[PDB]
């Protein structure tokens, strides 16, 4: 997992800096360890180690556990180190589903790691002062309404609570507080009525103490999976079918398990009554779509019963498999053309086959199929089974049967993507560090121009500062800017593939 290790490293550098990156990489390379050995191996001052570890545990990047003989073991979760890349995605979806107040709520919750109700609502109200002017005021009522709506919709989840000292282990406290998570109060928001008008940057006790909250990444991922499924169906059959899929996913979510291959049983009568009234559809029309969807050769949904006449269940894992297939065939077709995507999907359907059958079945011309078959064999996109003609398995006594392996595929495509995000960050940083000299040379003069502007200084500075050499370099600065922009957009997009890959490798993994 060296590529992943590097991704962790560069994310820590980007987001936290040097010492934090050092401690993080060391911990993910060493696993659970007590403080003293970590400080010894690193060799740095224990104050820096302590400070790093508390900032990481504040954002839940690391955890601490009481261990045998009373020592405290400290461990870091590698997966959580790959979530800040999706913070724009979380912010966008909450902005789509909630007003900018919810966007700011999620922003504060993420960037602070954890927050309490009073702290988060007060901070959001205070920061929103930059958004409203001309005497407009902000009261915690609407902020609290948006947060409780978020929590009810499962997007915001409560942090584990500390145990009660007077109720457990009286006397000298243990080395670590050993926090305990409670599920019945998971989305049970604390109650408050305080309101405070935001201070508009004029430059002139907690009722919910200990009730910390954090963003529900699982809910975000589930929402992303729903969006992907809805999009898949939209391209597949029709917008009406897509809206039906958007619908039965909605009642599915409120009751289905995130890991189950199949949703809870859903009838057409409940779909119709919960179906939006803005579409001119009857119950019989809905039944027709559901019956013809269940008859889909891709088996996207299955009947699975007959209660209420219309009875259907979506196959999440099978849909994810189709998603994983489509993305893999996407890469193949741009890397090798339609014919390569043709030869493979032939092999996907024909589980076992050899060159002559492939050529016959696709008229891939002689001296073309074989060479291409050798090439994408070299890419590990195809596995050779090689049955014997004799128990020696000699090359003259074997048949070269071809065989697919989707799971291994999804894995080392994902590794490809991991190396992808890394070497982009390498170039973005390489460009940033090479241009830093001109950047600071332009920023200092820009600050000079921007400074003492409201003071009423004379206008003989705008033109007199621009005669410098950076003026015929602004186009190069914009060249760098669009280059970083163009890099970033691809990074954003790559994260969109990553979701499909990670979702399928997760679902196919049984976790036993």
């Amino acid at each position: 997992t060296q590529a992943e290790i590097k991704l962790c490293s560069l994310l820590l550098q980007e987001h936290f800096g040097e010492i934090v990156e050092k401690i993080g990489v060391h911990l993910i390379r060493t696993g659970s360890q007590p403080l003293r050995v970590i400080a010894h191996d690193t060799g740095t001052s224990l104050d820096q180690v302590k400070k790093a570890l508390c900032v990481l545990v504040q954002h839940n990047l690391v955890s601490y556990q009481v261990h045998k003989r009373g020592v405290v073991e400290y461990e870091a979760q590698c997966s959580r180190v790959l979530r800040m890349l999706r913070y724009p995605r979380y912010i966008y979806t909450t902005k789509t589903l909630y007003s900018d107040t919810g966007e700011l709520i999620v922003e504060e919750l993420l960037l602070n790691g954890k927050l309490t109700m009073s702290a988060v609502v007060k901070k959001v109200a205070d920061r929103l002062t930059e958004t409203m002017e001309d005497g407009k005021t902000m009261d915690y009522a609407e902020v609290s309404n948006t947060f409780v709506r978020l929590a009810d919709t499962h997007f915001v989840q409560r942090c584990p609570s500390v145990p009660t000292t007077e109720n457990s282990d009286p006397g000298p406290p243990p080395p670590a507080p050993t926090l305990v998570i409670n599920e019945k109060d998971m989305y049970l928001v604390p109650k408050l009525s305080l309101i405070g008008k935001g201070k508009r940057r004029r430059s002139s006790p907690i009722p919910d103490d200990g009730i910390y909250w954090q963003a529900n990444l699982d809910r975000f991922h589930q929402h992303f999976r729903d969006q992907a499924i809805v999009s898949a169906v939209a391209n597949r059959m029709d917008q009406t079918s897509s809206e039906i899929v958007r619908t039965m996913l909605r009642m599915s979510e409120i009751t289905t398990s995130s890991s189950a291959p199949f949703t809870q049983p859903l009838s057409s009568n409940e779909i119709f009554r919960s179906l939006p009234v803005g579409y001119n559809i009857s119950k019989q029309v809905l039944d027709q779509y559901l019956t013809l969807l269940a008859d889909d050769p891709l088996e996207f949904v299955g009947k699975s019963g007959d209660s209420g006449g219309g009875m259907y269940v979506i196959n999440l894992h099978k849909a994810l498999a189709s998603l994983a297939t489509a993305t893999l065939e996407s890469v193949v077709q741009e890397r090798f053309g339609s014919r390569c995507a043709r030869i493979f999907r032939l092999v996907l359907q024909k589980k076992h086959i050899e060159q002559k059958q492939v050529e016959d079945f696709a008229m891939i011309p002689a001296k073309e199929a074989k060479d291409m078959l050798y090439k994408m064999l070299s890419e590990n996109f195809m596995s050779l089974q090689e049955i014997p003609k004799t128990p020696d398995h000699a090359p003259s006594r074997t048949f070269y049967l071809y065989t697919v392996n989707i799971l291994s595929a999804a894995r080392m495509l994902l590794h490809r993507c991991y190396k992808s995000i890394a070497n982009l960050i390498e170039r973005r940083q390489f460009e940033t560090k090479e241009n830093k000299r001109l950047l600071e040379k332009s920023q200092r003069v820009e600050a000079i121009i921007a400074s003492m502007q409201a003071t009423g200084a004379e206008e003989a500075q705008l033109q007199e500062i621009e005669e410098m050499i950076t003026a015929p370099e602004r186009q190069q600065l914009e060249t760098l800017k669009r280059n970083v922009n163009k890099l970033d957009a691809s990074e954003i997009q790559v994260d969109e593939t990553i979701f499909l890959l990670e979702s399928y490798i997760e679902c196919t993994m049984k976790r036993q």
Binding site: K51, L53, H59, Y87, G210, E334, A489
Partner: protein, 82 residues
Amino acid sequence: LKPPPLFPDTDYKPVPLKTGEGEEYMLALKQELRETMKRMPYFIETPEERQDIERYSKRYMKVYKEEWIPDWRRLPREMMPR
């Protein structure tokens, strides 16, 4: 005789990138974030060190900040910043 260029010619070239108001908004949000996590105590930069000489100016531009302290009930009683 001669090993090739380090950079062989390839017929297939990277698929063109997307653009749109949503993508631009996400890029702006990404720029905002990369500008944001530099401005709070969680961004633990290296402490200031190795003063050169006893300059008089130090009385004014000294950086002052609060000793950040989380909810200590939630952490072991072993890393007090004092």
